[PDB]
Structure 1
Amino acid sequence: QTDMSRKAFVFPKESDTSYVSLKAPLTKPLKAFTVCLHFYTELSSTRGYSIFSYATKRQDNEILIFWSKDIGYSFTVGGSEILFEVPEVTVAPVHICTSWESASGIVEFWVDGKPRVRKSLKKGYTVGAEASIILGQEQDSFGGNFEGSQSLVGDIGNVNMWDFVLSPDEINTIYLGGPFSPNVLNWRALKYEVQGEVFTKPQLWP
């Protein structure tokens, strides 16, 4: 097993082929999820980029967190999308957590430990468990059809996924970094393979 503790994937150039693919142990479909990660990029002013691409064979945008230029975070489940407008962006490593509960469709979006207002999305939908989870690229087909103009350039790490909505107090722990253990996707117990020009480096963020 690989323990990524204090290590981040570095995607130091724009390309369509540098990416890492993550394997979840998940088999049953998701009635809820929380995903959290650190990322650090310069792109935000220049262009949009894919942060986190979760594609099932039914749907290439089954979970997508997308920075949209001059807009903010696009959050999409099942191809349906909502925006958390971010009007001023700062060159610092940013930590996000995003939780989606099917039963109500409530999306919480958390940036550096601050919550966004709970929006509604895709109430009653079910996320498929058979997924190609890709970091560094946007996939428009199951595990493929990357576009360089949507690649992440820079750092991504601490990528953790839960099959349930974390409470606010939990998320405070994640941000400050107290003890936690994910069950869908564990940074400390990460099954992954790396394709293209991708490096593991010490994380820049504490």
Structure 2
Amino acid sequence: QTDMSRKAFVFPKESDTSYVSLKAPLTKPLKAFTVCLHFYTELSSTRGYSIFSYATKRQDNEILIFWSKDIGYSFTVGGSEILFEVPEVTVAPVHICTSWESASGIVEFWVDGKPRVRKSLKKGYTVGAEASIILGQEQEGSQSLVGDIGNVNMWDFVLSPDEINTIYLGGPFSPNVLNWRALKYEVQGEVFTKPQLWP
């Protein structure tokens, strides 16, 4: 239980063993969720990489925020992948918030405070509870994250825009699954903790 406020994990160079493991005190399977985070990297234009990986015994790609080169963002929950295209890539810290709701299969994807069209994905699904959450790696390094990532947070329900807007503006949020202000992690490899570059 550490307060990562104002700090961020940084992955200096391409590796095959460096990654961060977040431990979520999960007890109930997810029927909806929302994860937000900040990440800054220069890979975008050259190759792909993993931002957020959430895997279960039965499914290694239960919930995964990925960036496939020359295409855009790839949000995938429960093996099924959906794509949020992005034509012109810009090098700069970016903040994202994505959410999925089983009851309707509506997935939202917010980038830098602005929302992308809503979409449908994995209706009537159910995300496993006991899982292994990892930052910087793909549960292979050709998909490794090189740069900084931080301010990751996760709620077990779908945040409303107003709420999302606030989080972006750096307003007070109360996560209930993954809280940056009280994170329980386990580092491994060449990854450090330094003050965050984005405001």
TM category (shorter chain) comes to over 0.9
In the other structure, the counterpart of 2:65 is 65
TM-score of the superposed pair, with normalisation by structure 1: 0.96
In the other structure, the counterpart of 1:117 is 117
Structure 1: how far apart are the matches of 2:98 and 2:58? 22
| Offset at residue 15 of structure 1 (A) | 0.5
Spell out, residue by residue over 1:121-178, the C-alpha distance to the aligned partner (whole angstroms, 9 max, x if none). 0000000011100001001xxxxxxx11000000000000000000000000010011
Q: Which segments of 5 or more consecutive residues in structure 2 lack a partner in the other structure? A: none
RMSD in angstroms over aligned alpha carbons?
0.5
Structure 2: how far apart are the matches of 1:110 and 1:151? 23
| Offset at residue 181 of structure 1 (A) | 1.0
Identity, % of aligned pairs?
100
Q: Which segments of 5 or more consecutive residues in structure 1 lack a partner in the other structure? A: 140-146
| Offset at residue 96 of structure 1 (A) | 0.3
TM-score of the superposed pair, with normalisation by structure 2: 0.99
| Offset at residue 77 of structure 1 (A) | 0.4
In the other structure, the counterpart of 2:95 is 95
Spell out, residue by residue over 1:90-132, the C-alpha distance to the aligned partner (whole angstroms, 9 max, x if none). 1110000001000000000000001000000000000001110
Spell out, residue by residue over 1:37-94, the C-alpha distance to the aligned partner (whole angstroms, 9 max, x if none). 0000000000000000000001110001110000001000000010000001111100
| Offset at residue 25 of structure 1 (A) | 1.0
Deviating beyond 2 angstroms after TM superposition, the runs of 4 or more aligned structure 1 residues are: none
Structure 1: how far apart are the matches of 2:14 and 2:156? 32
2:168 is paired with a residue whose SS is helix
Structure 2: how far apart are the matches of 1:150 and 1:90? 19
Structure 1: how far apart are the matches of 2:19 and 2:75? 20
Structure 1: how far apart are the matches of 2:120 and 2:60? 21
Structure 2: how far apart are the matches of 1:154 and 1:124? 36
Structure 2: how far apart are the matches of 1:198 and 1:129? 27
Structure 2: how far apart are the matches of 1:108 and 1:11? 28
| Offset at residue 26 of structure 1 (A) | 1.2
| Offset at residue 203 of structure 1 (A) | 0.2
1:174 is paired with a residue whose SS is helix
Structure 2: how far apart are the matches of 1:200 and 1:41? 16
How many residues matched?
A: 199
